[PDB]
Amino acid sequence: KNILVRMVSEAGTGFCFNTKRNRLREKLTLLHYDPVVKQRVLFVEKKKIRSL
Amino acid sequence: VKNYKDLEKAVQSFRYDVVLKTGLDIGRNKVEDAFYKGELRLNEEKLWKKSRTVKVGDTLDLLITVMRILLKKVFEEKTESEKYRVVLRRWKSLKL
Amino acid sequence: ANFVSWKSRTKYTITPVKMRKSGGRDHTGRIRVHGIGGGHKQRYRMIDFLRFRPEETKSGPFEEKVIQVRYDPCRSADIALVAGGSRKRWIIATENMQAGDTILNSNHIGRMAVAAREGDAHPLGALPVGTLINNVESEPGRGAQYIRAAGTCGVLLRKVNGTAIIQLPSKRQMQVLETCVATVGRVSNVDHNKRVIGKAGRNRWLGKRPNSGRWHRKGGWAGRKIRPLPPMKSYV
Amino acid sequence: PALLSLDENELEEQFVKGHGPGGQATNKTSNCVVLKHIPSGIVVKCHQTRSVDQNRKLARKILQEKVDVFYNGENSPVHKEKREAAKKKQERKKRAKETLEKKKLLKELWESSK
Amino acid sequence: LTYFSARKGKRKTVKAVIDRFLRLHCGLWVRRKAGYKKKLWKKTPARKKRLREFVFCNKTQSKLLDKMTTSFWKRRNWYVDDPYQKYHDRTNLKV
RNA sequence: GUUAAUGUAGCUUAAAUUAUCAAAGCAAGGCACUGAAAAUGCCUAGAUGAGCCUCACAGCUCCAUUAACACCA
RNA sequence: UUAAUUUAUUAAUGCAAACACCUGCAUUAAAAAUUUCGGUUGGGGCGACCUCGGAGCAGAACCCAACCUCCGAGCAGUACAUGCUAAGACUUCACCAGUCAAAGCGAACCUCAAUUGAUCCA
RNA sequence: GCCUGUUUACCAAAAACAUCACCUCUAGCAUCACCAGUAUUAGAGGCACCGCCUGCCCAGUGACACAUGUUUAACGGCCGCGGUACCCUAACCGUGCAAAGGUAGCAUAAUCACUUGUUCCUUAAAUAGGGACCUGUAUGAAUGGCUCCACGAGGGUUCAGCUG
Ligand SMILES: [Mg+2]
Ligand SMILES: [Mg+2]
Ligand SMILES: [Mg+2]
Ligand SMILES: [Mg+2]
Ligand SMILES: [Mg+2]
Ligand SMILES: [Mg+2]
Ligand SMILES: [Mg+2]
Ligand SMILES: [Mg+2]
Ligand SMILES: [Mg+2]
Ligand SMILES: [Mg+2]
Ligand SMILES: [Mg+2]
Ligand SMILES: [Mg+2]
Numbered sequence A: 001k002n003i004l005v006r007m008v009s010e011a012g013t014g015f016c017f018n019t020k021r022n023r024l025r026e027k028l029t030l031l032h033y034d035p036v037v038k039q040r041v042l043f044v045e046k047k048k049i050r051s052l
Numbered sequence B: 001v002k003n004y005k006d007l008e009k010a011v012q013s014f015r016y017d018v019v020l021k022t023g024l025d026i027g028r029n030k031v032e033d034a035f036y037k038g039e040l041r042l043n044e045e046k047l048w049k050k051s052r053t054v055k056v057g058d059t060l061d062l063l064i065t066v067m068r069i070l071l072k073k074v075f076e077e078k079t080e081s082e083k084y085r086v087v088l089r090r091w092k093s094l095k096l
Numbered sequence C: 001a002n003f004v005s006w007k008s009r010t011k012y013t014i015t016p017v018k019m020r021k022s023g024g025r026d027h028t029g030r031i032r033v034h035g036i037g038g039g040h041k042q043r044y045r046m047i048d049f050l051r052f053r054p055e056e057t058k059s060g061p062f063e064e065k066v067i068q069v070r071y072d073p074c075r076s077a078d079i080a081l082v083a084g085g086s087r088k089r090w091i092i093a094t095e096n097m098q099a100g101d102t103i104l105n106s107n108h109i110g111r112m113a114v115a116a117r118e119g120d121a122h123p124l125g126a127l128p129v130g131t132l133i134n135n136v137e138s139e140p141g142r143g144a145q146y147i148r149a150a151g152t153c154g155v156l157l158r159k160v161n162g163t164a165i166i167q168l169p170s171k172r173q174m175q176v177l178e179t180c181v182a183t184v185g186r187v188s189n190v191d192h193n194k195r196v197i198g199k200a201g202r203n204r205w206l207g208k209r210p211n212s213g214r215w216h217r218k219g220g221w222a223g224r225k226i227r228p229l230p231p232m233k234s235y236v
Numbered sequence D: 001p002a003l004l005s006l007d008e009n010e011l012e013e014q015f016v017k018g019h020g021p022g023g024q025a026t027n028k029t030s031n032c033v034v035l036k037h038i039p040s041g042i043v044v045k046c047h048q049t050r051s052v053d054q055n056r057k058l059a060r061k062i063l064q065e066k067v068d069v070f071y072n073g074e075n076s077p078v079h080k081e082k083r084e085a086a087k088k089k090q091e092r093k094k095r096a097k098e099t100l101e102k103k104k105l106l107k108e109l110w111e112s113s114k
Numbered sequence E: 001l002t003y004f005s006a007r008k009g010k011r012k013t014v015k016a017v018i019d020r021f022l023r024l025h026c027g028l029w030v031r032r033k034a035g036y037k038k039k040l041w042k043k044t045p046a047r048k049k050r051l052r053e054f055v056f057c058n059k060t061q062s063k064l065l066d067k068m069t070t071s072f073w074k075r076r077n078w079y080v081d082d083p084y085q086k087y088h089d090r091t092n093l094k095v
Numbered sequence F: 001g002u003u004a005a006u007g008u009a010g011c012u013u014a015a016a017u018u019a020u021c022a023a024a025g026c027a028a029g030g031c032a033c034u035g036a037a038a039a040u041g042c043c044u045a046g047a048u049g050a051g052c053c054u055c056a057c058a059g060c061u062c063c064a065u066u067a068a069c070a071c072c073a
Numbered sequence G: 001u002u003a004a005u006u007u008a009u010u011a012a013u014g015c016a017a018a019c020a021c022c023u024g025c026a027u028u029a030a031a032a033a034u035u036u037c038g039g040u041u042g043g044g045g046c047g048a049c050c051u052c053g054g055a056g057c058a059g060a061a062c063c064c065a066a067c068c069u070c071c072g073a074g075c076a077g078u079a080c081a082u083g084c085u086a087a088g089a090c091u092u093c094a095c096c097a098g099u100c101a102a103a104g105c106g107a108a109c110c111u112c113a114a115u116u117g118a119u120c121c122a
Numbered sequence H: 001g002c003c004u005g006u007u008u009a010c011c012a013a014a015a016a017c018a019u020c021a022c023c024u025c026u027a028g029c030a031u032c033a034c035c036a037g038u039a040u041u042a043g044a045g046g047c048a049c050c051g052c053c054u055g056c057c058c059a060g061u062g063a064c065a066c067a068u069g070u071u072u073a074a075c076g077g078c079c080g081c082g083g084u085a086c087c088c089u090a091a092c093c094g095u096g097c098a099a100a101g102g103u104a105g106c107a108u109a110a111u112c113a114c115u116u117g118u119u120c121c122u123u124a125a126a127u128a129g130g131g132a133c134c135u136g137u138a139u140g141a142a143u144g145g146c147u148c149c150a151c152g153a154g155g156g157u158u159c160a161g162c163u164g
Helices: B031-035 D052-071 D095-101 E045-051 E059-067
Strands: A002-009 A016-022 A029-034 A039-050 C016-018 C043-045 C062-070 C079-084 C087-092 C102-105 C121-123 C132-134 C154-160 C163-167 C173-177 C181-184 E029-031
Touching (some): A002 A029, A016 A039, C102 C121
Antiparallel strands (some): A002 A016, C016 C043, C079 C087, C121 C181, C132 C154, C154 C163, C163 C173
């Protein structure tokens, strides 16, 4: 039903965080707090870790 | 056009008894006497064994000169363990 | 163990050699074959299966003179004492062999065949097609190993480019050379198949112990195996 | 075709040990009923369970088949479904004839094909 | 554990203890929390903080790990640039 | 005895909500007339009785129905 | 044995190597080898059951059994600061786990009773 | 159970095992078993003389052949559901499922239960014995089926005798 994706940052790279989304609706793109640059950066998903 | 109907019957197991009458809707009871009377031919042959299996395109008979019951599907879901819901032809049309 | 095999005599004699039963047992004292043991005592009469062999300072074909046709304990066919020149030897009798027969053992592959009589030894090159043979060799000079059991015969099916073809009693074709010698006629003691052991005692007189009582379930090996006849075995 | 009933009375139920097909439990157990009919002479035993709550309620079910033959005879619901369910065995061995006759008509026509 | 060994006759250490626990010299045993890196997608940020904490042990847990190590691991270690050098002393205690 | 399964139009399976077409029976509709091919309708208390919502669905009240365990001393 | 683990073993095939046998490696056989045959249970088997939560028993701090009585759970939804740190407490009668949390930093102008799985390892 | 034989030495001698006979399978061959043998032979098995016979089934598992086939005297298996049959009698018709649906024979048997089946003989009286009938819903054909001759320290029944 749901999917545990990994969301890779764009600026201040290397910072990943895992969130959940539906299997069917499109890839995620979120505005999430990046502590590397201490800002809010766009985060774009890259993989699905597990189809829970 | 010539004769085509009778798609999507769930047969129980591929067999020249149930790929017969399911398609020419009768039972197994005349078919077993069609079997024992020279009839119930295969693809222009003679079936002397009424459990010979049936794949895609195997052209049934019974010679009423005939009425064929051609086959093409696999259809691959399951219909409560009569799984083989296969489409199948129907005829009453003559053959040389 | 201390098992020396009795087969130690290195010379041919007419005389009966005292044998030893094996018990079905090896030289290591253990059983290898079950169901053998303890029949009537027998003595061994040594059979010359190289049927055409010249004696010392002789060569070529010879005739032989049957002296007796005699029961043999060690085989199912009965044997023939034949004497030619100045030596005696045991050979195996053909179907209607009597004393006073003159049997020919020849070396001659000719231009034509031989209308060969019932008990006489010839090469398979010297023989018509369809005749019944016995005591076949598989090599020229080898000695008889094939059809020599009782009543058995084999037809000579065809001759090829330097080669004669047999049909064994098991209906299997065997291809040999044309110059290995085999006698005509079937072997003696027909109606060995038509025999009755009658009682369990006459089975144990022939040295045959009873089978085990262990009930064995039959497996996959036990159908009515309708197999192809095995392809021709060639000795060339 | 129901089986005609039997009264709550007139049934001399004795309780004995009976046959014992076991080690020590079945020598000392008065499990066998001897449920009798007082009118007719029909004596029924039961060691069908190791429990009288199914011995006695099944001993009653046997007795109402035996005393049924007494008050009806050979035309009873206890012989109707003996002659109706062995009626089929003449419809099973005659059925099996006509197909072992047509299994030689199709076996001799087999292999006499060329 | 092995109370007397077969070669020298000394006590042995259980090496499964040494690879998980840190003994401070004062007597305490620092450990990690079980599941601190497992299934963090279903844990809360308050619970994920609790799992990332170097946690002291019991009295009978510390007594258990003391019988399981030799006196080499109960020792003054004067390292170069230690992150737990400030924890070997047991300051201001009134028992 | 005890769980356990099962119930389909007149005839066979379906359908995991909403009920089908496949035969048979009403005829008419191509065809000179019969045969399909069509184009109809048609017949299921979904074997019960209550309604929890809104239910062949998800469960007892149920009726018949078949399998299977009721043992050791 | 159609339990798990093996194929050393002989026997076949295959590839190497040597210029068929011997050797090494693979597969497929048979023959075998080693090991186990959970627990609760109004005796054991059979049936059922095993972890978590809510209600009753257990009336009012806490706790409280049952092959005791009745309901559930093995998710979903919304965020995307569901960032980081840190006083003091709670705690399922131990441990492990599990809870709540002021302030502070950075920003802003979680819902739900349970909704679960340690270590080693990959 | 065909027979004579064999067996749990020290609780079972038997209906068990063997056994002639019958069939299936494997093997085309020499110098230590088989064998100084050679397919009418040898080895591995099943069943049990003879007489009369051994029905259907190759889907599975096996084995053999890769002509996806052959094979049951290989492992084994040989169903049911509805329902008109009337001196208790023509499914006389519809079907489901399977590889095939149990044929001949025999039969309450050493054959689940019911079970002391029903009935006749035998007995003063019979849960015993014997002859019949019969679904036997769990009979049945080399897991061999059924007759039958002799034989058995087998297991039941019995006439007459005879005896503490
Ligand atoms: Mg034998
Ligand atoms: Mg035997
Ligand atoms: Mg236990
Ligand atoms: Mg109990
Ligand atoms: Mg506590
Ligand atoms: Mg704060
Ligand atoms: Mg005997
Ligand atoms: Mg002996
Ligand atoms: Mg004894
Ligand atoms: Mg003895
Ligand atoms: Mg026997
Ligand atoms: Mg005797």
